[PDB]
Amino acid sequence: REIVHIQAGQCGNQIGAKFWEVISDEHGIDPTGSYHGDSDLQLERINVYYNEAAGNKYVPRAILVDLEPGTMDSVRSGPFGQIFRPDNFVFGQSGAGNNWAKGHYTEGAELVDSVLDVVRKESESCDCLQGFQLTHSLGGGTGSGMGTLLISKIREEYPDRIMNTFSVVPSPKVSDTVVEPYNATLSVHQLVENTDETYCIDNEALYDICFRTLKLTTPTYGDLNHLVSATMSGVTTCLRFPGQLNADLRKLAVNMVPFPRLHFFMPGFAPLTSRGSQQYRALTVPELTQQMFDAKNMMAACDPRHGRYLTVAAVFRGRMSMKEVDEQMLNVQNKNSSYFVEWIPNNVKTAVCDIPPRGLKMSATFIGNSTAIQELFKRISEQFTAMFRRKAFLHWYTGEGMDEMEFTEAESNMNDLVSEYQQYQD
Amino acid sequence: RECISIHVGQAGVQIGNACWELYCLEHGIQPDGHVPRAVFVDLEPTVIDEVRTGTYRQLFHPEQLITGKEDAANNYARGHYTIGKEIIDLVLDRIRKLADQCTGLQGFSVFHSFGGGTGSGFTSLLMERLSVDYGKKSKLEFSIYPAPQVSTAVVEPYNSILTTHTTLEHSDCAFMVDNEAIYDICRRNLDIERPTYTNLNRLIGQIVSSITASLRFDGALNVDLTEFQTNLVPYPRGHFPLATYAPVISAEKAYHEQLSVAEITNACFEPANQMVKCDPRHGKYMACCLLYRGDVVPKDVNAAIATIKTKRTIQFVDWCPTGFKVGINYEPPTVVPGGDLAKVQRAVCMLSNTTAIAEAWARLDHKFDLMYAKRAFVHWYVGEGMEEGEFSEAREDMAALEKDYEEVGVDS
Ligand SMILES: CC(=O)O[C@H]1C(=O)[C@@]2(C)[C@H]([C@H](OC(=O)c3ccccc3)[C@]3(O)C[C@H](OC(=O)[C@H](O)[C@@H](NC(=O)c4ccccc4)c4ccccc4)C(C)=C1C3(C)C)[C@]1(OC(C)=O)CO[C@@H]1C[C@@H]2O
Ligand SMILES: Nc1nc2c(ncn2[C@@H]2O[C@H](COP(=O)(O)OP(=O)(O)OP(=O)(O)O)[C@@H](O)[C@H]2O)c(=O)[nH]1
Ligand SMILES: Nc1nc2c(ncn2[C@@H]2O[C@H](COP(=O)(O)OP(=O)(O)O)[C@@H](O)[C@H]2O)c(=O)[nH]1
Ligand SMILES: [Mg+2]
């Protein structure tokens, strides 16, 4: 099987560097080097993310889409930056304006064809394609607009292969941009209707989880990114490993989406202990479920405790008892019968790889489909209206060839999306 | 004389590798000896690959190892219809190529995992295409039906109410081994909170050895495969008996091993030892096939059973005077060199049809409704060449399986 990553925008891009920083080491691939793999198993399934050309050069099969040179020229001028074949860099030296409209209708719409071109060169690579990984932020141009287009096109070209989306939904407390809800509401819209698996991460849900669950005092972006990339590795790549009970994107999809919206999840990693001290090793297993299922530790902003779950997928990856795994999951399902929805006898989807995260003994990625994420699109949707009402920075959109009915559309859509999700919380 | 076997679904393949292990182990045929007599099907390469990479690597022909690099999908539909279809031909071909090479066979011991994609769906049509190509044989499918509370897949029931209805009108005798109810045995009758799948497999890998292996093997009271279905199914519904083993004692902890027949047979009817969460909560047995192996005196049996026939609290069906098929083999069991199985010199792999499953099916049917009641993951099948028909019409199916297993009992 296979997949083809997609680094839309700067963020989605910045993260690319971290997702590939990791993944590679979790596959023994040095900058341009080959497979130094401490083992021999980190190779029989690599294909999922690379391509064979030389014999020591397995190049990441991702796409780097962005209308701001400097960015990709920071990712390509640093560490692992020199492993991507230049063909991968689909830049847009234009003005990468922070407008969803500027990267979806006017500026991005041009650079698109020169992207799809490659997304096809990579898809028609070899063997059988599974789906595409998509990273980006719903709070900017090259991210929400242009990346949200990249998919609307992808999903017309292969409505068969899957589409996981890793979105950095606009954090609450403080917005790292101003129109944010504009660029956001507009991209979520496109998401709820193309990709079929979305993993929403919040820069501040991370800080928290990174400053209190990792006594880490100076959580640089690199970190946040790093933590995130840690989860997306547990998801995909991982399951493309052996296991007593293994799954793969689809299983994950076909066990997690009760209703076609596409629904968004909230990823959570397992061993998340501070370096030295904490290295408690309390990782027998009840310790991992202890972790994963708590409020804090959910990369999302919202707290599960604020709304039932529809599905859950503990994708563990480290030798354990299909008994102490299958078992724990249960008590968990009974101690919290309250929030776990009922019309699904077994919400949880236990998954079990074998080999764990390179240096760790036992981990377990968590992919939750809780109704709690209602209380986020609400947020976003609110911010919109409060500012849409006055058409705040709307001239930067319309003036870019947009529509007063376009914004209406998205909000509503994504706004209805909130509605539905409640239809199950009850 | 023989009995081919088709291990379908990752699980049916893991269990397969296991049951297949125990085999050579008690036949003195190391890694590289003769030639198996089965096949392996899966729509996820990486798993059958485990049989291609791991142990018992060269004991198979890359011809009896079928794979569909494509996608597994934990959904019946896709595995049965859409994808699973493409492979079937090829699959069949082997069970027609392997079915020819032999000499007057008896049937195909099928190994699948009820609630899976490749295991539920696919087989559904595999057994389907068999019942027509060899209606004149035995179709005993050995299943691992849905843990009563510890299921895995979110949809499981969708996949198991569908493998039951499609296979029902095609199997001869469906053996059942409950994944969870086997754990209990690993906790309560062997002690270990560290049971790897690789163990449950060693277990069924045992109970199964008692079925084919040893039985098709000479003895003081041989029992052919046909024998089963005959002495085991009272009615055409591909009736599903339950597998049970007796000396499930730990090869470390306790040691009373020397547990004469009189004991090991009583240890079969206590509900805490039956590889199935179908505790005889009321289910009246209606036929049991006590397969013994090792040093056993026919009188010991034709007495140990007599004592039972008169315990009454073990209430057998009405319309059934005597429902005890005593199968005696010679060669004692054969435990893994150093797993965790005791290793006695006699065992009792008793299987049976019990009005008990009236439960197990019930509890699994109900599940289904809850979700169907909201269509839950329905769009996943529809979009895979299925319809509101196949679901609703396979629900009605089992409905008359809840009435069937009710009527054939509870009444006189
Ligand atoms: C001596 C020793 O055992 O060190 C550990 C360690 O101290 C701890 C604290 C690690 C450490 O992780 C962090 O401090 C961290 C930093 C930024 C963001 C997130 C986490 C570690 O850096 C991370 C590193 O993780 C791995 O090696 C995994 O394979 C992981 N790899 C990466 O994230 C990675 C990092 C740099 C470069 C390339 C990859 C992984 C996890 C999931 C999927 C794929 C890969 C490990 C076990 C450790 C150190 C090295 C200190 C922990 O994290 C992980 C992801 O394992 C933090 O809590 C866990 C518990 C570990 O015990
Ligand atoms: N006893 C036993 N049960 C197993 C084993 N592997 C899986 N199972 C059980 O069988 C079911 C899992 O089926 P899956 O592995 O998801 O799927 P599959 O049937 O192989 O086919 P796909 O869905 O297409 O992958 C669960 O109920 C597991 O508890 C095994 O090795 N032994
Ligand atoms: N986790 C994370 N968030 C980022 C990174 N870079 C920008 N962001 C977030 O992305 C939003 C800004 O969008 P941006 O990526 O600049 O848009 P674009 O570059 O025009 O497509 C803010 O909410 C930031 O917190 C990053 O490297 N990691
Ligand atoms: Mg499988």
Ligand SMILES: [Zn+2]
């Ligand atoms: Zn003794």
